[PDB]
């Protein structure tokens, strides 16, 4: 996250770090949202590579012991069947990970609340992106979890010529685009948290930014719209 601030430790307890084995160590690659004690919601493109993955819940600092983490392997990966890695603009950038063990819930580890099916947010609705992604375009991962205020940009504005044009679909949420704050590489798969009727809910799964850079005016960060996939998510969890 570019232009972010450090999140308090128990503000976003459904945020997870998705990591892959790298020789003797583990490397952060993406975010995700804990949605069941044994299921994580993330972006399909995050699990495109045939790597060994683990989830860390209760994580705040990737380079220090926080004394709150739980580490669990990924037992099964279900990518949306319409996902195509050479066409992120088509959508369907979502996947579910079944964890090998169920995690324990506490003030650092909670389930993400998902919106009702079909919910679309009014233009300029208040949302926060969270993640350990790059803090500058072509920069480096954050050590501590970051948050940035990204108000939504509705479909008619976001799909206009000056913004993303045909690249954005109604199965997506746009947020931000102010030129200062944005998602960045390493934030993919994590949540977009939006305040509705007094409660934060995870309306988006981080998916893409401009090839020109992360924080680019009129290229808001784009997210898979969770509320378009509620039946898909329930169908997988039920059938798995
Ligand atoms: Ca840590």
168: left (phi over 0), alpha (psi -120 to 50) or beta: beta
Write out the residue range of the structural domain in which residue 87 sits: 13-111+228-240
For 188-214, give one letter per residue: b (16+ CB within 10 A) or e: bbbbbbbebeeebbbbbbbbbbbeeeb
Q: Resolution, rounded to a tenth of an Å?
A: 1.6
Residues 152/19, Cβ–Cβ less than 8 Å: no
Cα pseudo-dihedral 161, 208, 236, 78, rounded to 10: 130
| Gap from CA of 180 to ligand 1 centroid (Å) | 27
* 91 in the same domain as 1: no
Numbered residues of the known binding site for Ca(2+):
59, 61, 64, 69
Judgement on whether residues 103 and 188 belong to the same structural domain of the protein = no
Return the half-sphere exposure (C-beta side, CA atoms, 13 A cut-off) of residue 168.
28
C-alpha torsion sign, points 114, 120, 121, 123: positive
DSSP E strand boundaries for 68-187 = 70-79, 95-99, 127-131, 146-149, 152-153, 172-175
Same domain membership, residue 239 and residue 219: no
The closest alpha carbon to 204, from 226, 182, 221, belongs to 226
- Which residues are registered as beta bridge partners of 96? 41, 78
Q: Are residues 5 and 30 in the same domain?
A: no
Spatial separation of the C-alpha atoms in residues 224 and 215, rounded to whole Å: 19
State in Å: Cα 67 to ligand 1 middle.
Answer: 7
Q: How far is the CA of 146 from the centre of ligand 1 (A)?
A: 14
Within 10 A of 104 (CB to CB), how many other CB atoms are there? 11
> For tokens 């949420």, what's the residue?
173
212 and 118 share one domain: yes
Q: How many Å lie between the centroid of ligand 1 and the Cα of residue 71?
A: 11
How far, in Å, from the CA of 160 to the mean position of ligand 1? 41
Take residue 109 and report the two structure tokens written for it: 């580890």
**Is residue 44 within 8 Å of 82, Cβ to Cβ?**
no
Cβ(1)–Cβ(34) below 8 Å: no
- Gap between the Cα atoms of 161 and 167, Å rounded: 10
| CA torsion angle 217 88 59 180 (round to 10) | 0
CA pair distance 62, 40, nearest whole angstrom = 19
Instruction: Please identify every residue annotated as catalytic.
Output: 45, 93, 188
Same domain, 60 and 75: yes
Residues 29 and 89 both lie in one domain: yes
Distance 70 CA to ligand 1 centre (A): 10
What residues have their beta carbon closer than 5 A to ion ligand 1? Answer: 61, 66
Residues 118 and 8 in one domain: yes
> Do 46 and 189 meet the contact criterion of CB atoms below 8 Å apart?
yes
User: How was this entry determined?
Assistant: X-ray
Q: Are 80 and 88 in contact (CB under 8 A)?
A: no
Same domain membership, residue 222 and residue 122: yes
8: burial class by Cβ within 10 Å (0-12, 13-18, 19+)?
A: exposed
Q: Within this chain, do residues 34 and 68 fall inside the same structural domain, yes or no?
A: yes
Q: Is 70 exposed, middle or buried (0-12, 13-18, 19+ CB in 10 A)?
A: middle
Decide: helix, strand or coil at residue 133.
Answer: coil
Same domain, 122 and 219: yes
Q: Do 223 and 240 sit in the same domain of this protein?
A: no
Backbone angles phi, psi at 34, to 5 degrees: -70, 120
- How many domains does one find in the chain? 2
Give the sign of the dihedral formed by CA 11, CA 2, CA 19, CA 167: positive
Q: Which residues contact 22 (CB under 8 A, 6 or more apart)?
A: none
Report the CATH number at residue 149.
2.40.10.10
């Amino acid at each position: 996250v570019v232009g972010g601030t450090e999140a308090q430790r128990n503000s976003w307890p459904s945020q997870i770090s998705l990591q892959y084995r790298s020789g003797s160590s583990w490397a952060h690659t993406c975010g995700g949202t804990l949605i069941r004690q044994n299921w994580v919601m993330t972006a399909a493109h995050c699990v495109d590579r045939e790597l060994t993955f683990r989830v860390v819940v209760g994580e705040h600092n990737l380079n220090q012991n926080n004394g709150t983490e739980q580490y669990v392997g990924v037992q099964k990966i279900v990518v949306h069947p319409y996902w195509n890695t050479d066409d992120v603009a088509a959508g369907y950038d979502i996947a579910l990970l079944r964890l090998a063990q169920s995690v324990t819930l506490n003030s650092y580890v909670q389930l993400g609340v998902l919106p009702r099916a079909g919910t679309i947010l009014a233009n300029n609705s208040p949302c926060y992106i969270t993640g350990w992604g790059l803090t500058r375009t072509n920069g480096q991962l954050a050590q501590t979890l970051q948050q940035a205020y990204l108000p939504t940009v509705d479909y008619a504005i976001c799909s206009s010529s000056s913004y993303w044009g045909s690249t954005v679909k109604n199965s997506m949420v746009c947020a931000g685009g102010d030129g200062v704050r944005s998602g960045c590489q390493g934030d993919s798969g994590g949540p977009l948290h939006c305040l509705v009727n007094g409660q934060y809910a995870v309306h988006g799964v981080t998916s893409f930014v401009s090839r020109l850079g992360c924080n680019v005016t009129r290229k808001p960060t784009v997210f898979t719209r969770v509320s378009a996939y509620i039946s898909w998510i329930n169908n997988v969890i039920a059938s798995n």
